[PDB]
């Protein structure tokens, strides 16, 4: 449309040397040109100074200072982040991640790495403390490394045990802009794909993660600037006490990529274990089952909201299931299970990080058991089957799945309590005059092998119907 009048004015131009002479006279006499250049870096052909130009464009894009010394060597330069492609330290590592991205045509991941390296050193201090602040992170990282190695000294456990129940976790050290990732949990479903063997080339995203970092806060805290574990209790870790240290206006963080919904009693348990307040302002509490459903539905997004009204449907092989997750059922205190989304847990010194993680592992395990109901499969109002189930919270870390007896007509309620990360105990609750359905250890076996409600309910139904 506008191109037609553009071609008409172009026909008027046919009816430019004077324009070049005008540009020359102005030469004898900003943002737009560089913006067009940064759009057009996509269309540059592969060549050595052109790739230097596109890397300079990445530098201008993420706010960093480019400097070439040749067509080979180009430096990205800011107050501490200084590295080349061919402050206060060497250029440490020829890291294969950045080189592997740049040897291919993967410049956006290079941009993400420079974004992460900006967000590491964007701390508010006058730059001197910044160095010391980064040093504190280094000390923390070293301590964290030792603890995982201490666990590898303790037992020669596989990576799965290192994830599920060990100290720290599967620990990927930092490399470029990617900060240090602890994998504290991987579910029995998310372990499997479409039956994964878990050998030490395990994926970064294969589970639930938490990245450790430093961040400037509004308060002042005392953090170590030295590797705090010089002496190690041979099966534990043991920390020499503080001061060294200095009172940086910052704190260590465990940032989760996807915010975890946690209950109120979790908030008090973690503020007891840490000592530092978690929610600086008090947030707006919500029922946990809303947050669990928003978490599980916002895993795989679609533009249509499900409009569930807490009545989820499950299409299974030899069965069809319905679930009522039943928020606002009152606890013994008289209130529903109220929780909020946590994303950043602040700790001061690294000895807290196993205990903190055990708490989060507990919480994440509980969410997976309530995560298995939240599905998008709509087998709406099918007259065959639709075994109508209910989930209610009797307490923190306990819940109950209530459902019709497969033989008789009284209710049967299976109460599940999540003791630890991989241990959930189960009790069948039955009328005094009913049929034998299952033993509790069978329910514990199916739960710990699958970590999903509907699979255990089908196991209950099938082992009832064989008898």
């Amino acid at each position: 449309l506008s191109k037609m009048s553009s071609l008409l004015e172009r026909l008027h131009a046919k009816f430019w040397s004077e324009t070049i002479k005008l540009v020359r006279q102005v030469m004898e006499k900003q943002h737009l040109v560089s913006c067009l250049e940064t759009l057009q870096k996509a269309l540059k052909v592969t060549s050595l100074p052109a790739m230097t130009d596109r890397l300079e464009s990445i530098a201008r894009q993420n706010g960093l200072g480019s400097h070439l010394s040749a067509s080979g060597t180009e430096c990205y330069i800011t107050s501490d982040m200084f590295y080349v492609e061919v402050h206060h330290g060497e250029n440490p590592v020829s890291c294969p991640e950045l080189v592997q991205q740049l040897r291919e045509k993967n410049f956006d991941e290079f941009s993400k790495h420079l974004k992460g390296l900006v967000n590491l050193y964007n701390l508010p201090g006058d730059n001197k403390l910044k160095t010391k602040m980064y040093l504190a992170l280094q000390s923390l990282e070293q301590d964290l490394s030792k603890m995982a190695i201490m666990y590898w000294k303790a037992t020669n456990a596989g990576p799965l045990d290192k994830i599920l129940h060990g100290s720290v976790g599967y620990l990927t050290p930092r490399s470029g802009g990617h900060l240090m990732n602890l994998k504290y949990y991987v579910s029995p479903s998310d372990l499997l794909d479409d039956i994964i063997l878990h050998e030490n080339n395990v994926s970064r995203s294969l589970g639930m993660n938490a990245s450790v970092t430093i961040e400037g806060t509004s308060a002042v805290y005392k953090l170590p600037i030295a590797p705090l574990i010089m002496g190690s209790h041979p099966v534990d870790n043991k920390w020499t006490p503080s001061f060294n240290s200095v009172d940086l206006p910052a704190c260590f963080f465990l940032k989760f990529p996807q915010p975890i919904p946690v209950s109120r009693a979790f908030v008090q348990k973690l503020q007891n274990c840490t000592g530092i307040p978690l929610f600086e302002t008090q947030p707006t509490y919500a029922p946990l089952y809303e947050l669990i459903t928003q978490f599980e539905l916002s895993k795989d997004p679609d533009p249509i909201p499900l409009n569930h009204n807490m009545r989820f449907y499950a299409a299974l092989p030899g069965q069809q299931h319905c679930y009522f997750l039943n928020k606002d059922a009152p606890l013994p205190d008289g209130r529903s299970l109220q929780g909020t989304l946590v994303s950043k847990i602040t700790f001061q010194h690294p000895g807290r990080v196993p205990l903190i993680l055990n708490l989060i592992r507990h919480q994440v395990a509980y969410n997976t058991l309530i995560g298995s109901c939240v599905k998008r499969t709509i087998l709406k109002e099918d007259s065959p089957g639709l075994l109508q189930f209910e989930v209610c919270p009797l307490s923190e870390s306990r819940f109950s799945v209530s459902f019709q007896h497969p033989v008789n007509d009284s209710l049967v309620c299976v109460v599940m309590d999540v003791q630890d990360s991989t241990h959930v105990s189960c009790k069948l609750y039955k009328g005094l005059s009913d049929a034998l359905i299952c033993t509790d250890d069978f329910i514990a076996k199916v739960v710990q092998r699958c970590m999903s409600i509907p699979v255990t309910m089908r196991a209950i139904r099938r082992k009832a119907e064989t008898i």
Binding site: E390, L394, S402, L411, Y429
Partner: protein, 121 residues
């Protein structure tokens, strides 16, 4: 057909207590004051199976007491036949149900119902 099946259908499709009352009327043409059919017994059995009572069937029983569907005598007998006593939550629910009708405890019927209220007390 049975009272257990009607209460259990009332649990399956979520029925509010008044819709439960209407559909309970419709399932049974003879009311038989609902105590010949032992409404309080079936509601207490299928409410007190878990460690904690499901609030749906307790809401059904509290409506069936507050509205005068079920006499106090059948409720007090069905409360008396529970024991177990290892669960404090079911016992607290039974004491709230007793907190509803006690101090009122007024039969308005035949004298045999009053004798039944005496034995039930």
């Amino acid at each position: 057909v049975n009272l257990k099946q009607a209460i259990l259908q009332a649990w399956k499709e979520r029925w509010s207590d008044y819709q439960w009352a209407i559909n309970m009327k419709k399932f049974f043409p003879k009311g038989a004051t609902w105590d010949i059919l032992n409404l309080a017994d079936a509601l207490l059995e299928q409410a007190m199976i878990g460690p904690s009572p499901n609030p749906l069937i307790l809401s059904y029983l509290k409506y069936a007491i507050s509205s005068q569907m079920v006499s106090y005598s059948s409720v007090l007998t069905a409360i008396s036949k529970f024991d177990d006593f290892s669960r404090d939550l079911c016992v607290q629910a039974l004491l709230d149900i007793m907190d509803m009708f006690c101090d009122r405890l007024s039969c308005h019927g035949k004298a045999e119902e009053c004798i039944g209220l005496c034995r039930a007390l």
